[PDB]
């Protein structure tokens, strides 16, 4: 099992979500952004595992789900199985990654993905450990209901450039946005 990250789109007040749906109009390529990430392994037939809430699972587009060519994971202690579509259900954080632990999981599995929401992007942030956030910046304020963590800067270090992530100024339906990158290690 490689790296843990987390990886998120949000907008300048911090939003990433509004009545079951991200705050902004659709962005296909910061979608394809994010489908590019969490996909690309970087050791062959090896895959990657994203974990996410019960309310992000539900929230993708159902032919949009399970998230093609990785392992989905979906967390929830009401389920008492995997949603339809999906591969994995765990009751916490630590489990679900106890559970890339096992014999099954651990030589499958390359990168770790948390791709959202706002609880398990907080308790994974404030973890010890390495870990990269993989941001993208929609650079407008959106009316919100769901919102990002803060990111200590003192802790997360913004990396000037990283391989596969375009770097400057993007737009799409009038709306710019940038990707930018965040390790910690402690
Ligand atoms: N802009 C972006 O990058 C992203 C946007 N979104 C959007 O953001 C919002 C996500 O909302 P959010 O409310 O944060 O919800 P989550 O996806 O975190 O779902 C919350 C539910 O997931 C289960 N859950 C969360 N953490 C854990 C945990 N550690 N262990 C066990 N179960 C857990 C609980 O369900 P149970 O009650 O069943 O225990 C909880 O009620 C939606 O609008 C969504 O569309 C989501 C991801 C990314
Ligand atoms: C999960 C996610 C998506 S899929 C998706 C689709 C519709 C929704 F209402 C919601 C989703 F969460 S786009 C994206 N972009 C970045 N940068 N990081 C992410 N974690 C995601």
Redesign the pocket.
């Known amino acids: 099992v490689g790296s843990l990250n987390c ?5 300048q007040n911090m ?9 902004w109009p659709p962005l296909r390529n910061e979608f394809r952004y ?1 489908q590019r990430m969490t996909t690309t392994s970087s050791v062959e037939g090896k895959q990657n595992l994203v974990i ?9 587009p159902e032919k949009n789900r399970p998230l093609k060519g990785r392992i989905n994971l ?6 008492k199985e995997p949603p339809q579509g999906a591969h994995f259900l ?7 990654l106890k559970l890339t632990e096992q014999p099954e999981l651990a030589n499958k599995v390359d990168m770790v993905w948390i ?7 907080k ?1 994974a942030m404030n973890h010890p450990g390495h870990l990269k956030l993989f941001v ?1 910046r ?1 650079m407008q304020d959106f009316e919100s ?2 919102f ?1 963590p803060e990111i200590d800067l003192e802790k997360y270090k913004l990396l000037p450039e990283y391989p596969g992530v375009l770097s400057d100024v993007q737009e799409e339906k009038g709306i710019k946005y940038k990707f930018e990158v965040y390790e910690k290690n402690d």
């Open positions: 990886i998120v789109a949000v907008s939003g990433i979500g509004k009545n079951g749906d991200l705050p994010f996410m809430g019960k309310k992000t699972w539900f929230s993708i979906v967390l929830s202690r009401e389920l765990s009751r916490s954080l630590d489990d679900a791709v959202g929401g706002s609880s398990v992007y308790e993208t929609i209901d769901t990002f």
